[PDB]
From a paper:
In conclusion, we have resolved the full-length structure of a [name] transporter, a member of the CorA MIT family. [name] is a distant homologue of CorA proteins, which are well-characterized magnesium (and cobalt) channels. By combining all available data from us and other groups, we conclude that [name] is a zinc importer that is driven by a proton gradient. Each protomer of [name] consists of a large N-terminal cytoplasmic domain folded into an αβα motif.
The apo structure of [name] was obtained by single-particle cryo-electron microscopy (cryo-EM) using n-dodecyl-β-d-maltopyranoside (DDM)-solubilized and purified [name] [name] (EcZntB) (pre-treated with ethylenediaminetetraacetic acid (EDTA)) and resolved at an overall resolution of 4.2 Å. Analysis of the substrate translocation pore revealed a wider profile in [name] than in the magnesium channels TmCorA and MjCorA. All three proteins have short extracellular loops between TM1 and TM2, where the family signature motif GxN that forms the selectivity filter is located. Our work on [name] shows that the mechanism cannot be extrapolated to other members of the family, because even after an extensive treatment with EDTA [name] maintained its symmetrical pentameric state. In contrast to stringent removal of Mg2+ from CorA channels, the depletion of Zn2+ from [name] is likely to be physiologically relevant because intracellular concentrations of free Zn2+ are extremely low (i.e., in the pM–fM range). Therefore the symmetrical structure of [name] may better represent the apo state than the asymmetrical structure of CorA. Whereas our structure was obtained in the absence of Zn2+, StZntB was crystallized in the presence of Zn2+. Calculation of the surface potentials revealed dramatic differences between full-length EcZntB and soluble StZntB. The cytoplasmic domain of full length EcZntB has a strong positive electrostatic surface potential (resembling VpZntB), whereas the potential in the isolated domain of StZntB is negative. Furthermore, the shape of the internal pore between two forms is different possibly resembling two conformational states.
Author numbering:
A (entry chain E), B (entry chain D), C (entry chain C), D (entry chain B), E (entry chain A): 1 to 327
Write the structure that this text describes.
């Protein structure tokens, strides 16, 4: 655990491989590289690939329990102290352009003061962010700077998705503005994404703090400071989002309340339009009858007689409508 | 970073600045002033404005991680220790004069004992309150008096706000009188405002207690005591408000069941008038036909006969109404 | 704060003013009294009186930060340490017959080892209890035993209030008594008063524990023991009302499903009556028509034949109801 | 206070009283007995009796604050250290066959290191089981053996009861086996029963825990371990029961959703029957008319010609629902 | 007690027993065996067998309280140290195809450094898994390896089960895919199984951590570390599952939302079809009448008159639907 060679880390199926000068150095690896704490080496892999998997399960540099903890196993943000070794993994929020369900994006990093290795399956964009700000050399200095910078990308895109849900539900003032119903099958979607992001950020906050509260031998205390309030930077993100689970609590309840209000104002029409069904029992009840008797023969022009008495009934009960509305 | 000349902090596009005397009064900022513990000064911006933002990003008087932080991006009622630097950022309750949604107002203070700087986007009632207090002449003596006074106005207006929420919901005694329903879409914004007040007071409670817990090098211990019971003042304030989220809990559930049981009474009317109008289709059954036979011709004057017999049918099943009310 | 003259305490608009002998008896206040810890005198005010407000805000006997606190603006209980001074503010359970909403029964006591002040606005039956018990010689000895006995009266009066709503709740076993229904808009009163008992007892419990938390120069350790098990009395009242919001929760849900199943019986009757009004369209569909042809003229006396056919259709589909209840 | 005599504890209206030998034996009382820790004595009363109340209020054994409160006051269990005294009060569950509501079957036991005294109101089968253990002859050794045996008794019977409601609700899965509805009001009363058992058990493993850390002068460390793990045996007791309030949480909700599923079946039938009886009203529209014109007289035998078209409306719309189910 | 003979633990009706070589190997028992920590023996039984029942009821090697505890009686995911003894008792997942209810698959272990013994009632597939691990020679080294390996089996199996219903409720995306209903009586099964696995895993996570924090002689610090991240390996298991109680919380609410929505758009038919149900007292209201007058005889061909005026009623008020849709 004192000498590291550039050859065994040099993988053909490796996606990404770099040196770290201490500035943001863009230097791809060789087969004759000196790798230490003075020369940290970023990697990035894809365990779907062939020799990424073989080198992932066979390399003599990293231990055995972290071999098959590193090729698509967990559903959780673990950290694990391995003496000098340090396993982190934490989750990001992307996919293709279209997977709004399954906000799980794994990214797994076995790392120490000398050599890191990062591994993914689907395309992380936060790792694309930490790539895309180092070609000009303003990115990370070392592995500690790498870790706090990728936590800055994670809090930035995770925080943007937090406020993205937040202005999806703050767009739901439509529940009182006209009392417009939200679209059919919609609140379960972002409310689903909301609670699953509770169960991913909610251990990710103290995986960040469990980084920052613990003294790894190779951060700076400035990196532990910005790590500390970046852990809090996830923290009020997560109380924003369980404020949003409350807000979809009231939202999802009172939309059911207002559609049963639509039931009630429908049964206004069922009530009074059932009171239009009232004189039918005497509409046919005197007139659809074929019997040998005298129902209305005693007075000529009987049509206006029932034509006024049925609205004596309708207007009278209509005057009871402004009195009791029952019985 | 020992002393600061008065023109260095001087910003044209600032809202203003000031000079705290220590007697509770104030003096405006001059160009050749001395900024120290002997002469503390409040300086206030509006970071919407242009050179406000330029000085906000380019001054040498505050570190990098508070440079962008005073530019209006977090939903975080946060304190951030920067050694001698001390950032706080707290929330108030306004908008324009008309926004009952979005009761969030950001105010920010970067702070050391010499200069204190408050930046806002929109206006703050509390900052106006300590304005009228400070050209009144018995406002803040110093920066400690600044903090305890601005927290007195923040807690005072927030406590008044949750007070008028409390009498809006204790005004909801239409549950008992008439069982009168609240207006269509009205508890979504009371209950919405209520939970968002939980989210913006509950980190603010321990931003207050997190101020009063540590020993900053510039407060009096009397200001720590005032800070302490004002922290608990907002604390049991939010105990009133989640008492109110329980009270909108029962209130929303019982309005849902009371209009639901109103609907149940409406279909009770539909049921009773349904079995009252059983014999209408049956009277069309016996009497609304066209056959080559004898319907009732063997006995004269059947109109009195059937208009008796359906009525005694209705009264019979009406005795089964009070008798059974089933089947 | 070494000696107090009998006129500074003396207020004309004072409701009560007393002299704790230490023997459990009492004496009224005189004008030339020297009161101390050996002569712990007593007050009771009503701050809505104007001279009560004047002495309440202008006396030199209590500091400024508790001057306004005794003037009736709280929504809450507290205890605030003021060095030698000690503030408690504290709630009770009172009103006349027509105040079962708004249990806001305030009771404020600023005190030390020598003097107390006990201000109210509306009457307090606990203070009425110890006023009913101090003249008979078996009241309190001094201020420690005073607020001991005060907490005795209000915690067993609040305890019997909690017991009273509890016997209403256990009087709601009519849910299984043939599903007998609570009155229209009634559980919002028990549930509302219940949770407002949770809020106005819950900081009160650790007001009491916060009394016996520290040593104070005017209690006994026996009175601290009395304080802790009386806090145990109240806190077990708090678990009583916690289980009452639970049991009231399941009550409020089951009455809603009782309304749902009664409505299911209403539309059960509407379903069976709908199948009873299936032969409307065959009834008029063969018989109420007016066309130039032969519908049933080919066989004489067809009244029994449509009686037979609609009976076998109705009883037939009733047998299909006995087959599979649907389709 | 020392060398307690048998005449002091001799109560005629007591239920019984014995000595504890150490073997689990049993010996009745005399009037010349030496009650010590070498010969511990159990007393058992029924405090509703008049002389039981007289000795209960007037004995020179136990102090004043445990005199009255031992006779029917606490709605809840507790411990209370009284120096040498140790008040305990527990709760068990019994009745006749008919008191399954009101599971408050109390147990008030003042403990002193020589005389231990138990008062009940109604009969408790737990102490009946300890009675069977002691006339059995291998019951309690001493007051410590008394305590572990009574806690084992009502711990076992509490565990059997929570097992009884557990396999009541594990029978409640015919609601997935062809969705058999639970009987009327059945969830409410056992849901009530185990939630008041959350009002008892969560105040019971804490009174056992305040037996656990409480190094009493008369416990044994073996028996400390005995009521330690029998305390946590009750601990997995109440995690069973709040798991069961979750399980009747879901079980309470899903019967409501399946209730509206059956309601959706019958308004499915009301919908299709309403649209299939739309042509009835237009049949009366064309054929229930008495006017001087030519409705359909221009072609002979119109009965088949409209009996076809009503069928093609019915089967036509019946083909529209097989593609749309809507409008 | 020291050199315990293999004949003492030899049971005829044992399911099996072996030694542990320290390599993962397997050797059957004899009756001339010396058992220690150097030769660790594992027994596995089935306590329903009467010979094994007599053995574990009557063997003199294990203590008294663990005798009936190992006899298979109660829902115990717990641990109790007995000095040199150690009772652990855990829960797994097994059954045939038809035991998805009753997820209790108990395994019980009395153990020490020397003689470690496991009882069960129904088969555990995790114990079968470690049997398959040891019979090939790659099983556990010692009793500590036996414990951590059987924890690896059953946490792997419980972990893939909580994964299994975790992606069974992700197969509940029919909620927005056409808003397709879940099957009738289905979420009580899945929702049942995840709350019951909160009931099981929630004491089992800290039976694991309570093993890990307990310095035991028969363990190793490597197995303590492996014990601790297998403890948290489960622990992210259970926050996955209460995340899933939230996700079936929103799912179970919105299915009632969407099926009442199906009722809601369903009674559009019972609104517009109700206002085509109103003119039945008009189209027969003038025309199904038998009276001696002139209803429409003054103008010829009345059939094309109402044949258009019912259209100017229906289409006109149908245009009032596009105006206000109510009243």
């Amino acid at each position: 655990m004192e000498a590291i060679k550039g050859s065994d880390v040099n993988v053909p199926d490796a996606v990404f491989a770099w040196m770290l000068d201490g500035r943001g150095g863009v230097k791809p690896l060789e087969n004759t590289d000196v790798i230490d704490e003075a020369h940290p080496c970023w990697l990035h892999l894809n365990y779907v690939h062939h020799d990424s998997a073989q080198w992932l399960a066979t390399t003599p540099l990293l231990p055995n329990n972290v071999r098959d903890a590193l090729a698509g196993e967990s559903t959780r943000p673990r950290v694990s102290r391995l003496g000098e070794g340090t396993l982190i993994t934490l989750r990001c929020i992307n996919g293709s352009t279209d997977e709004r369900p399954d906000q799980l994006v794994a990214m797994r990093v076995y790392m120490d003061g000398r050599l890191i290795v990062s591994t993914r399956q689907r395309k992380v964009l936060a790792l694309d962010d930490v790539v895309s700000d180092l070609e000009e050399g303003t990115g990370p200095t070392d592995c500690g700077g790498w870790l706090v910078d990728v936590c800055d990308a994670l809090t930035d895109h995770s925080s943007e998705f937090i406020e993205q849900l937040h202005d999806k539900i703050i767009d739901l003032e439509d529940n009182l503005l006209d009392q417009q119903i939200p679209p059919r099958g919609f609140l379960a979607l972002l409310r689903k994404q909301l609670i699953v992001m509770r169960r991913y950020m909610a251990p990710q906050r103290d995986v960040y703090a469990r980084l920052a509260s613990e003294r790894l031998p190779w951060m700076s205390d400035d990196q532990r400071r910005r790590m500390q309030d970046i852990a809090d930077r996830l923290g009020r993100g997560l109380d924003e989002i369980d404020a949003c689970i409350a807000r979809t609590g009231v939202m999802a309840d009172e939309i059911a309340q207002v559609m049963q209000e639509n039931l009630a104002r429908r049964t206004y029409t069922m009530s009074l339009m059932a009171m239009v069904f009232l004189p039918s029992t005497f509409l046919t009840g005197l007139f659809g009858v074929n019997l040998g008797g005298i129902p209305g023969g005693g007075w000529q022009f009987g049509f206006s007689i029932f034509c006024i008495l049925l609205v004596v009934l309708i207007g009278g009960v209509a005057l009871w409508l402004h009195r009791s509305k029952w019985l």
